[PDB]
Amino acid sequence: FQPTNGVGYQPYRVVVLSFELLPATVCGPKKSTNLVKNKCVNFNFNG
Amino acid sequence: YFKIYSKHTPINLVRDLPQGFSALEPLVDLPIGINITRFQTLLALHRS
Ligand SMILES: *[C@@H]1O[C@H](CO)[C@@H](O[C@@H]2O[C@H](CO)[C@@H](O)[C@H](O)[C@H]2NC(C)=O)[C@H](O)[C@H]1NC(C)=O
């Protein structure tokens, strides 16, 4: 590879991520919210 | 899941499995997913 490479011949980094499932160990971010008290609220605490 | 519960107690016996009551609290729950059928312990020895 050279600095003056063409778009087709220019280098490209490639990464393939394969997910294997058959207890799952890597899960999603599982975003959260703020806590509010003293009101009729629909709550979800860790499932 | 490999579950390990633990407890530690102070005693002053010489040779017995002491009586009494003590509930073991959970220590860890490791997501291993292996097939376990046999196990062994590992001790320490003194040398000089
Ligand atoms: C964990 O491994 C043991 C290996 O000793 C398995 O016990 C054997 O299981 C096979 C079935 O695949 C039987 O044909 C053998 O007769 C079993 N041997 C003994 C000594 O029991 C055991 O089944 C495995 N556990 C799981 C959940 O698969």
Side-chain angles (χ1 to χ4, degrees):
Chain A
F1 297 95
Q2 289 87 17
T4 187
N5 287 1
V7 66
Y9 176 70
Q10 268 165 4
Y12 274 69
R13 291 165 169 196
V14 181
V15 193
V16 186
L17 282 295
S18 310
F19 313 116
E20 189 276 330
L21 187 151
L22 61 87
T25 70
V26 67
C27 292
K30 288 180 177 179
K31 299 207 205 163
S32 315
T33 63
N34 193 284
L35 181 68
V36 69
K37 310 168 186 178
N38 311 109
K39 305 177 187 61
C40 191
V41 170
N42 200 328
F43 58 86
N44 185 352
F45 286 96
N46 285 10
Chain B
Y1 283 108
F2 191 74
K3 309 179 167 177
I4 293 163
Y5 310 72
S6 179
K7 191 74 152 62
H8 180 304
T9 314
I11 50 172
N12 203 248
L13 66 87
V14 56
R15 60 99 177 172
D16 198 8
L17 185 56
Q19 68 93 25
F21 192 58
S22 55
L24 319 184
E25 320 199 344
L27 183 63
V28 60
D29 192 308
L30 300 172
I32 309 316
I34 59 175
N35 172 24
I36 297 169
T37 61
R38 298 167 68 253
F39 90 99
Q40 178 182 173
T41 187
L42 317 182
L43 283 72
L45 55 87
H46 303 179
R47 290 182 175 183
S48 178

